[PDB]
Structure 1
Amino acid sequence: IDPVVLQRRDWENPGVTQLNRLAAHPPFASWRNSEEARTDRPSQQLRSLNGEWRFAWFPAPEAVPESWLECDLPEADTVVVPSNWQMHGYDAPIYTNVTYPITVNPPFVPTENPTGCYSLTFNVDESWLQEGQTRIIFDGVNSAFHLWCNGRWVGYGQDSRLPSEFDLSAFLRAGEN
């Protein structure tokens, strides 16, 4: 995968902690019924994309083949999301206390940078696209990520412990995405 994304190396620049990320806010559900809001019941406007996803491990972002942007890699596995890929055995989890698990050379990280390629094919109803705004919410991604929707680059996010949100309204189509 290329070109601006690999050349710009946003994950080695503390001046770039996000690209195209929406403003942070308190928890939303966008109820269209007041009584459902009052009683804190599920909202039709808030969908979980949790469940079975496609996943492939790579030793570095340079190793990621371009075709992955367009379609599923045959060598990928089907895995549960949310998950830490170390818990599925793709590489080792590391326990260190104080000493960084990487060479201390800010803002640089090792060239061998384990890379998790997650993908999902899913439906979007036309009602969601005729009007209004459809965003995706990643509550936790460790430690940084680039996002594509239907082959098009959407954005980038950092901070493993807060939600990253991106407007997908111009990226989605009715049916399979």
Structure 2
Amino acid sequence: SCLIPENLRNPKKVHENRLPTRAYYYDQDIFESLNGPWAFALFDAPLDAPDAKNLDWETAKKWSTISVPSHWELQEDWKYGKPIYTNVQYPIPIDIPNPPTVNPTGVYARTFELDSKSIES
């Protein structure tokens, strides 16, 4: 299935380059929040989303913003769709391990500042 990206239909692709899980401790001196408004655009499926290897901030600057954290089905005026409630039944067809081809894809973008000392320290 070349109309569905390989990583969305591979049960073994649990992650790529994720660090090993460790015990959680919040530390104010280490943690720096990136919450707030992010550039955001929603696409019908992966193939409509831009290549992120070529996405400028100059390009993404022009998008509407969404606030992190939040679900995109819970925005002012249901802008990016509405919630779906199912109990037992899957809301998709069962064709393990394939997701549906039409697969809502949201691209988030924001920037942050880094010091000369920061990268060294």
Cα offset, 1:114, TM superposition: 0.3
Q: Distance in 2 between matches of 1:125 and 1:48?
A: 16
Residues 1:15 and 2:12 are matched in the alignment: yes
Deviation sequence 1:37-79 (CA, Å, 0-9, x none) = xxxxx62221010111111000101001236633333652112
TM-score (normalizing by structure 1): 0.58
Q: Distance in 2 between matches of 1:94 and 1:113?
A: 15
Deviation sequence 1:7-53 (CA, Å, 0-9, x none) = 85211100111000001111134xxxxxxxxxxxx622210101111
Alignment partner of 2:103 out of 109, 113, 117:
113
DSSP 3-state at the match of 1:25? coil
The root-mean-square deviation of aligned C-alpha atoms, in Å, is 2.2
Residues 1:46 and 2:36 are matched in the alignment: no
Instruction: Give unmatched runs, 5+ long, in structure 2.
Output: none
TM-score (normalizing by structure 2): 0.82
Q: Distance in 2 between matches of 1:109 and 1:7?
A: 8
Q: Distance in 1 between matches of 2:10 and 2:83?
A: 25
Residue 8 and residue 59 in structure 1: after superposition, are their counterparts in 2 closer, same or farther (change >3 A)?
A: closer
Q: How many residues align?
A: 114
Verify the 8 A CA contact 1:56 1:75 in the aligned structure 2.
no
Question: Which structure ranks higher in relative contact order (CA pairs < 8 Å, sequence separation ≥ 6)?
Answer: 2
Deviation sequence 1:63-110 (CA, Å, 0-9, x none) = 012366333336521121001001122022111111101111111001
Cα offset, 1:126, TM superposition: 2.8
Instruction: Give unmatched runs, 5+ long, in structure 1.
Output: 1-5, 30-41, 132-177
Residue 76 and residue 22 in structure 1: after superposition, are their counterparts in 2 closer, same or farther (change >3 A)?
A: same
In the alignment, which residue of structure 2 is the partner of 1:140? none
* Residue correspondence of structure 1 range 12-91 to structure 2 within 5 A: 12-29=9-26, 43-66=28-51, 69-71=55-57, 72-73=59-60, 76-88=63-75, 89=78, 90-91=80-81
Greater strand percent: which structure?
1
Q: Distance in 1 between matches of 2:95 and 2:7?
A: 16
Corresponding letter in the other structure for 2:15: Q
Q: Distance in 1 between matches of 2:106 and 2:4?
A: 19
Corresponding letter in the other structure for 2:22: H
Verify the 8 A CA contact 1:53 1:118 in the aligned structure 2.
yes
Q: Distance in 2 between matches of 1:10 and 1:83?
A: 24
Corresponding letter in the other structure for 1:43: Q
Q: Percent identity?
A: 39
